[PDB]
Amino acid sequence: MKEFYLTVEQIGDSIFERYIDSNGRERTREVEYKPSLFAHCPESQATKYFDIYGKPCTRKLFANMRDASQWIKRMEDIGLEALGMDDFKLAYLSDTYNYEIKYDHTKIRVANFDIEVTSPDGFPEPSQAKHPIDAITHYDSIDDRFYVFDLLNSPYGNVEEWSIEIAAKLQEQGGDEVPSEIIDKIIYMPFDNEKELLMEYLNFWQQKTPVILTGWNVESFDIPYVYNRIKNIFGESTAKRLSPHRKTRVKVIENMYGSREIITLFGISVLDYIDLYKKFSFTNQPSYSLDYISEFELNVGKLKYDGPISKLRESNHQRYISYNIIDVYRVLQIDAKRQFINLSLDMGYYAKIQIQSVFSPIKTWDAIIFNSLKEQNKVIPQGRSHPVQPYPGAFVKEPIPNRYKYVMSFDLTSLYPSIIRQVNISPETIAGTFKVAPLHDYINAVAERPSDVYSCSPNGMMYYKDRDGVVPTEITKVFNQRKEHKGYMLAAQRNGEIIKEALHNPNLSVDEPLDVDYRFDFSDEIKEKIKKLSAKSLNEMLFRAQRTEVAGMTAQINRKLLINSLYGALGNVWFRYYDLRNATAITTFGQMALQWIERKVNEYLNEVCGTEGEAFVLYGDTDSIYVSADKIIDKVGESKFRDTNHWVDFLDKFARERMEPAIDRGFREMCEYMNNKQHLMFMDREAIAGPPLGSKGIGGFWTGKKRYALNVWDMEGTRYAEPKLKIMGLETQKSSTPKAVQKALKECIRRMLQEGEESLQEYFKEFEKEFRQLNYISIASVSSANNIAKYDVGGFPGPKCPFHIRGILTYNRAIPQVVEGEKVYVLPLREGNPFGDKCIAWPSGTEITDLIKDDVLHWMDYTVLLEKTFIKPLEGFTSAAKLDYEKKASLFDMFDF
Ligand SMILES: Nc1nc2c(ncn2[C@@H]2O[C@H](CO)[C@@H](O)[C@H]2O)c(=O)[nH]1
Ligand SMILES: [K+]
Ligand SMILES: [K+]
């Protein structure tokens, strides 16, 4: 079989590679790679190698990688360009795997692990590793087993062994409810001292060395801590055994507050799952803790345990070990439905890069373009340094703060990559420049046509229309590949149905599943044989068809991500193909496109509605516009509609049959104005929002850029039974917003948009009345404790001290401990309180210690709390929407109705 690599590393003059050989067995080899680079040569020198500009090149084959590195330096000193792939790992992978890689993930050892550490304060510093590791949960994908290393004796407490029988029992039976499916997959190993624990873990590691090392927050805590702990206890040499090549690299990261440590283990690809999640998930959750993402993805309640998390081992060691196991399973569950690990492998093998490079758009695209050009004997340009110069970003319209009853949004398809293809922007397609007028002149089409022969962008750049272009050609390839895999996905879908229709009274005769390609529709002859297969064979065929569907899904999602990350690479000064002029040409064209279409839509709606100078477009952000449909609805007459679904259908039709054609018309004109290579500005209806028919709801409101709320009924063709609240930038989900207030503010917004001012006013009165009976933890706000010592002057706040830091200081005077950088709950205190200040703070996720809890709660300033956390932000919403959360005085007040 075709072999595939696992990991690759460069150590001196050799490439250390772990891979799956022809016999499907994992192996390691050291290769004295002889790299090739290129230098320009005279036309006289005949060759097949040319750079992207068409200039001839000659190949230089080196004896070793060190010589190639020196040569580059020598060329640079002189001033000559040194072309070719300077990252020898990519060159090696490109030469060694000169074919489309077909990998088998079941042979790739993926470890998902977790390291637990008890400490008096509860947030031990990884770079120090001053405390013992008292629990290690290591799930191995090949063995499909959870290895649990449990420390029984510790200076922080001696405990008894974990009970695998108690773990399964339900909550009421005093159990932990460890899923029945994984109970038999647990290998529990108790230890009396940390040294034996760690040494056995280290041996275990040498036998089942991870290829892919993952888990939640593994890069910032687990890895650094175990590496440093082993280093402190057994010495650096022992710690280096965590790397199959005994080579390690410790990088220190600087930040506003402190320094972090990141350990690179040669021979291992670390993919912290929290980062993998943040990169591939198409959302932006207000929190990325395992509990939050678990509830969101798996819809399961966060683990429950009384008391602080740093006290869980001492207070309930049984639940401590059971939960560590469950948390790892949780990550595994999240990967089961999101498939991010596999997505990483798919993307990695596609680009032919180290798997961990998926976190780097420039690295990924560099390899893709490199391998693609190599097939045409084209040589890549040497990377050149560029200063970080800020250039125009996306266009975001300043909205008029107000309520907007009916809104309809439209958006462009893959904007930036489409612009690249439309204008044909690439380093080698630059054809010149033209005298540029102000941007508003192109938007209004008052400026003279830039060029009659070249494709233009509003920033003053011109490109050839006749030439393909490396960047645009590569985008197109990926786009065509996405459709191809989409086709396989659908084919494996129709084939799956043919197999299911057969599972209805299948023949009993014994047979085997057919050897067919599920990516293509079944031929006639295949469908006839399928009519005679037994259930056993059909079920096996269904399993394979689905396996094919998923692979198709992963492949097309991979391509989508590649396309969406390209612009980021092109705007990165470290990208080989970066060009400030091209980055600017893309963004300014984007800005022109949105404002040009905003003018077109306004002109069209004023005409159609017989109005004048009316502003229909109320907001726009990057690739979408929001249109007020109030006038459109009035034109028809609201009493003319039967129900909500009626006006929604009307706007859907109006958008599709009227506005869209006008928009397409507007964009084709812009394309001719800029004389672009091809029209790709495709904008169509996205959402339709408004209040339910016959209600007094306001539908939606904007407070400013990126701050608004909409009551959505339809999203690109899919009609919702229950409207969905689209809320953005109103901080109703922000971690600093108290729990009860997050729910209250949302309810306030739902009522405003769906029921009206009156309903809002009754809920406001209701929440305010109930506020003082809610649990104190649910109404406290949350802040991060940064720079505590800075304002710590003899125990009291120095000048310019933050409100929450002041709280932390009064807490310290009063007395869990507050750890630098960590989060804390904050509560204001009434004047005359015994704590000596206007507020107090304590560790988040915990109750206030008993010695002061009741005093604190008795001095809590509920009024100030309510005003600051609830009323202030609500007032922001209502002022923008022109409403009162409190009924204004009326002449009818003095009456008793
Ligand atoms: N065509 C091409 N080959 C390259 C480049 N950089 C390195 N090579 C090497 O050229 C050789 C094969 O044609 C291999 O050893 C490649 O790794 C580049 O930009 N283009
Ligand atoms: K964790
Ligand atoms: K836990």
Coordinates of all heavy atoms in Angstrom, one line a residue, residues 271-314:
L271 N -2.0 19.2 19.1 CA -3.2 19.9 18.6 C -4.1 20.1 19.8 O -5.0 19.3 20.1 CB -3.9 19.1 17.5 CG -3.2 18.8 16.2 CD1 -4.0 17.8 15.4 CD2 -2.8 20.0 15.4
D272 N -3.9 21.2 20.6 CA -4.7 21.5 21.7 C -6.2 21.6 21.1 O -6.4 22.3 20.2 CB -4.3 22.9 22.3 CG -4.9 23.1 23.7 OD1 -6.1 22.8 23.9 OD2 -4.1 23.5 24.5
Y273 N -7.1 20.9 21.7 CA -8.5 20.9 21.2 C -9.2 22.2 21.3 O -10.1 22.4 20.5 CB -9.3 19.7 21.8 CG -10.3 19.2 20.8 CD1 -10.1 18.1 20.1 CD2 -11.5 19.9 20.6 CE1 -11.1 17.6 19.1 CE2 -12.4 19.5 19.7 CZ -12.2 18.4 18.9 OH -13.1 18.0 18.0
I274 N -8.9 23.0 22.3 CA -9.6 24.2 22.5 C -9.2 25.1 21.3 O -10.1 25.9 20.8 CB -9.2 24.9 23.8 CG1 -10.2 26.1 24.1 CG2 -7.8 25.5 23.7 CD1 -10.0 26.6 25.5
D275 N -8.0 25.0 20.8 CA -7.5 25.9 19.7 C -8.1 25.3 18.4 O -8.5 26.1 17.5 CB -6.0 25.9 19.6 CG -5.4 26.6 20.8 OD1 -5.8 27.8 21.0 OD2 -4.5 26.0 21.4
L276 N -8.2 24.0 18.3 CA -8.7 23.3 17.1 C -10.2 23.8 17.0 O -10.7 24.1 16.0 CB -8.6 21.8 17.3 CG -8.3 20.9 16.1 CD1 -7.2 21.5 15.3 CD2 -7.9 19.6 16.7
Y277 N -10.9 23.8 18.2 CA -12.3 24.2 18.2 C -12.5 25.6 17.8 O -13.3 25.9 16.9 CB -12.9 24.0 19.6 CG -14.4 24.1 19.7 CD1 -15.1 23.0 19.4 CD2 -15.0 25.3 19.9 CE1 -16.5 23.1 19.3 CE2 -16.4 25.4 19.9 CZ -17.1 24.3 19.6 OH -18.5 24.4 19.6
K278 N -11.7 26.5 18.4 CA -11.8 27.9 18.0 C -11.5 28.2 16.5 O -12.1 29.1 15.9 CB -10.8 28.7 18.8 CG -11.2 28.9 20.3 CD -10.1 29.7 21.0 CE -10.5 29.8 22.5 NZ -9.4 30.5 23.3
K279 N -10.7 27.4 15.9 CA -10.3 27.6 14.5 C -11.4 27.0 13.5 O -11.7 27.7 12.5 CB -9.0 27.0 14.2 CG -8.6 27.2 12.7 CD -7.3 26.5 12.4 CE -6.8 26.9 11.0 NZ -6.5 28.3 10.9
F280 N -11.8 25.8 13.7 CA -12.8 25.2 12.8 C -14.3 25.5 13.0 O -15.0 25.5 12.0 CB -12.5 23.7 12.7 CG -11.1 23.4 12.3 CD1 -10.5 22.2 12.8 CD2 -10.4 24.2 11.5 CE1 -9.2 21.9 12.4 CE2 -9.0 23.9 11.1 CZ -8.5 22.8 11.6
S281 N -14.7 25.6 14.3 CA -16.1 25.9 14.5 C -16.5 27.2 14.0 O -15.7 28.2 14.1 CB -16.4 25.8 16.0 OG -15.8 27.0 16.7
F282 N -17.6 27.3 13.3 CA -18.1 28.5 12.7 C -19.0 29.3 13.6 O -20.1 29.7 13.3 CB -18.8 28.2 11.4 CG -17.9 27.6 10.3 CD1 -18.2 26.3 9.9 CD2 -16.8 28.3 9.7 CE1 -17.4 25.7 8.9 CE2 -16.0 27.7 8.8 CZ -16.3 26.4 8.3
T283 N -18.5 29.5 14.9 CA -19.2 30.3 15.8 C -18.3 31.0 16.7 O -17.1 31.0 16.4 CB -20.0 29.3 16.7 OG1 -19.1 28.3 17.2 CG2 -21.2 28.8 16.0
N284 N -18.8 31.7 17.7 CA -17.9 32.5 18.5 C -18.3 32.6 20.0 O -18.3 33.7 20.6 CB -17.7 33.9 18.0 CG -16.8 34.0 16.8 OD1 -17.1 34.8 15.9 ND2 -15.7 33.3 16.8
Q285 N -18.6 31.4 20.5 CA -19.1 31.3 21.9 C -18.4 32.2 22.9 O -17.2 32.6 22.7 CB -19.0 29.8 22.4 CG -20.3 29.0 22.2 CD -20.4 28.6 20.8 OE1 -19.8 27.7 20.3 NE2 -21.3 29.3 20.1
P286 N -19.1 32.7 23.9 CA -18.7 33.7 24.9 C -17.7 33.1 25.9 O -17.2 33.8 26.8 CB -19.9 34.2 25.5 CG -20.8 33.0 25.5 CD -20.6 32.5 24.1
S287 N -17.6 31.8 25.8 CA -16.8 31.0 26.7 C -16.3 29.7 26.0 O -17.0 29.1 25.3 CB -17.5 30.6 28.0 OG -16.8 29.6 28.7
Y288 N -15.0 29.3 26.3 CA -14.5 28.1 25.7 C -14.1 27.0 26.7 O -13.3 26.2 26.4 CB -13.4 28.4 24.7 CG -13.9 29.1 23.4 CD1 -13.9 30.5 23.3 CD2 -14.3 28.3 22.3 CE1 -14.4 31.1 22.2 CE2 -14.8 28.9 21.2 CZ -14.8 30.3 21.1 OH -15.4 30.9 20.0
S289 N -14.7 27.1 27.9 CA -14.3 26.1 28.9 C -15.0 24.8 28.4 O -15.9 24.8 27.7 CB -14.9 26.5 30.2 OG -16.3 26.4 30.2
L290 N -14.4 23.7 28.9 CA -15.0 22.4 28.5 C -16.5 22.3 28.8 O -17.3 21.8 28.0 CB -14.2 21.3 29.1 CG -14.5 19.9 28.6 CD1 -14.5 19.8 27.1 CD2 -13.3 19.0 29.1
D291 N -16.9 22.8 30.0 CA -18.3 22.7 30.4 C -19.2 23.4 29.4 O -20.2 22.9 29.0 CB -18.5 23.2 31.8 CG -18.1 22.2 32.9 OD1 -18.4 21.0 32.7 OD2 -17.4 22.6 33.9
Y292 N -18.8 24.7 29.1 CA -19.7 25.5 28.2 C -19.8 24.8 26.9 O -20.9 24.7 26.4 CB -19.1 26.9 28.1 CG -20.1 27.8 27.4 CD1 -21.3 28.3 28.1 CD2 -19.9 28.1 26.1 CE1 -22.2 29.0 27.4 CE2 -20.9 28.9 25.4 CZ -22.0 29.3 26.0 OH -22.9 30.1 25.4
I293 N -18.7 24.5 26.2 CA -18.7 23.9 24.9 C -19.4 22.5 25.0 O -20.0 22.1 24.0 CB -17.3 23.8 24.3 CG1 -17.0 25.1 23.5 CG2 -17.2 22.7 23.2 CD1 -17.2 26.4 24.3
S294 N -19.3 21.8 26.1 CA -19.9 20.5 26.2 C -21.5 20.7 26.2 O -22.2 19.9 25.5 CB -19.5 19.8 27.5 OG -18.2 19.2 27.3
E295 N -22.0 21.6 27.0 CA -23.4 21.9 27.0 C -23.9 22.3 25.6 O -25.0 21.8 25.2 CB -23.7 23.0 28.0 CG -25.2 23.4 28.0 CD -25.5 24.5 28.9 OE1 -24.8 25.6 28.9 OE2 -26.4 24.4 29.8
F296 N -23.1 23.1 25.0 CA -23.5 23.6 23.6 C -23.5 22.5 22.6 O -24.4 22.4 21.8 CB -22.5 24.7 23.2 CG -22.8 25.2 21.8 CD1 -23.8 26.1 21.6 CD2 -22.1 24.7 20.7 CE1 -24.1 26.6 20.3 CE2 -22.4 25.1 19.4 CZ -23.4 26.1 19.2
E297 N -22.4 21.6 22.6 CA -22.3 20.6 21.6 C -23.0 19.3 21.9 O -23.8 18.7 21.1 CB -20.8 20.2 21.3 CG -20.0 21.4 20.7 CD -20.3 21.6 19.3 OE1 -20.6 20.6 18.6 OE2 -20.1 22.7 18.8
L298 N -22.8 18.8 23.1 CA -23.4 17.5 23.6 C -24.7 17.7 24.3 O -25.4 16.8 24.6 CB -22.4 16.8 24.5 CG -21.0 16.7 24.0 CD1 -20.1 16.0 25.1 CD2 -20.9 15.9 22.7
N299 N -25.0 19.0 24.7 CA -26.2 19.3 25.4 C -26.3 18.4 26.7 O -27.2 17.7 26.9 CB -27.4 19.0 24.5 CG -28.6 19.9 25.0 OD1 -29.1 19.7 26.1 ND2 -29.1 20.7 24.1
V300 N -25.2 18.5 27.5 CA -25.2 17.8 28.8 C -24.8 18.8 29.8 O -24.0 19.7 29.6 CB -24.1 16.7 28.7 CG1 -24.5 15.6 27.7 CG2 -22.7 17.3 28.4
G301 N -25.4 18.6 31.0 CA -25.1 19.5 32.1 C -23.7 19.4 32.6 O -23.1 18.4 32.7
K302 N -23.1 20.6 33.0 CA -21.7 20.6 33.5 C -21.6 19.7 34.7 O -22.6 19.5 35.5 CB -21.3 22.1 33.9 CG -22.0 22.6 35.1 CD -21.4 24.0 35.4 CE -22.0 24.6 36.7 NZ -21.4 26.0 36.9
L303 N -20.4 19.2 34.9 CA -20.2 18.3 36.1 C -20.5 19.0 37.3 O -20.1 20.2 37.5 CB -18.7 17.9 36.1 CG -18.2 17.0 34.9 CD1 -19.1 15.8 34.7 CD2 -18.1 17.9 33.6
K304 N -21.2 18.3 38.2 CA -21.6 18.9 39.5 C -20.8 18.4 40.7 O -20.6 17.2 40.8 CB -23.1 18.6 39.8 CG -24.1 19.3 38.9 CD -24.1 20.8 39.1 CE -25.1 21.5 38.2 NZ -25.2 23.0 38.5
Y305 N -20.3 19.3 41.5 CA -19.5 18.9 42.7 C -19.5 20.1 43.6 O -19.2 21.3 43.2 CB -18.1 18.5 42.3 CG -17.3 19.5 41.4 CD1 -16.7 20.6 42.0 CD2 -17.2 19.3 40.1 CE1 -15.9 21.5 41.3 CE2 -16.4 20.2 39.3 CZ -15.8 21.3 39.9 OH -15.1 22.2 39.1
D306 N -19.8 19.9 44.9 CA -19.8 20.9 45.9 C -18.4 21.4 46.2 O -17.4 20.6 46.0 CB -20.4 20.4 47.2 CG -21.8 19.8 47.0 OD1 -22.0 18.9 46.2 OD2 -22.8 20.3 47.6
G307 N -18.2 22.7 46.5 CA -16.9 23.2 46.8 C -16.0 23.6 45.6 O -16.3 23.2 44.5
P308 N -14.9 24.3 45.9 CA -13.9 24.7 44.9 C -13.4 23.5 44.1 O -13.3 22.4 44.7 CB -12.9 25.4 45.8 CG -13.7 26.0 46.9 CD -14.6 24.8 47.2
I309 N -12.9 23.7 42.9 CA -12.4 22.7 42.1 C -11.0 22.2 42.6 O -10.6 21.1 42.4 CB -12.3 23.1 40.6 CG1 -11.8 21.9 39.7 CG2 -11.4 24.3 40.5 CD1 -10.3 21.7 39.8
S310 N -10.3 23.1 43.2 CA -8.9 22.8 43.7 C -9.0 22.0 45.0 O -8.0 21.7 45.6 CB -8.1 24.1 43.9 OG -8.6 24.8 45.0
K311 N -10.2 21.7 45.5 CA -10.4 21.0 46.8 C -11.2 19.7 46.5 O -11.5 19.0 47.4 CB -11.2 21.9 47.7 CG -10.6 23.2 48.1 CD -9.4 22.9 49.1 CE -9.2 24.1 50.0 NZ -10.5 24.5 50.6
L312 N -11.5 19.5 45.2 CA -12.2 18.3 44.9 C -11.5 17.0 45.3 O -12.2 16.1 45.7 CB -12.5 18.3 43.4 CG -13.8 17.7 42.9 CD1 -13.5 16.5 41.9 CD2 -14.7 17.2 44.0
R313 N -10.2 16.9 45.1 CA -9.5 15.7 45.5 C -9.7 15.3 46.9 O -10.0 14.2 47.3 CB -8.0 15.7 45.1 CG -7.2 14.5 45.5 CD -5.8 14.6 44.9 NE -5.0 13.4 45.3 CZ -4.5 13.2 46.5 NH1 -4.7 14.1 47.4 NH2 -3.8 12.1 46.8
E314 N -9.4 16.3 47.8 CA -9.5 16.1 49.2 C -11.0 15.8 49.6 O -11.3 14.8 50.3 CB -9.0 17.3 50.0 CG -9.8 18.5 49.9 CD -9.0 19.8 50.4 OE1 -8.1 20.2 49.7 OE2 -9.4 20.3 51.5

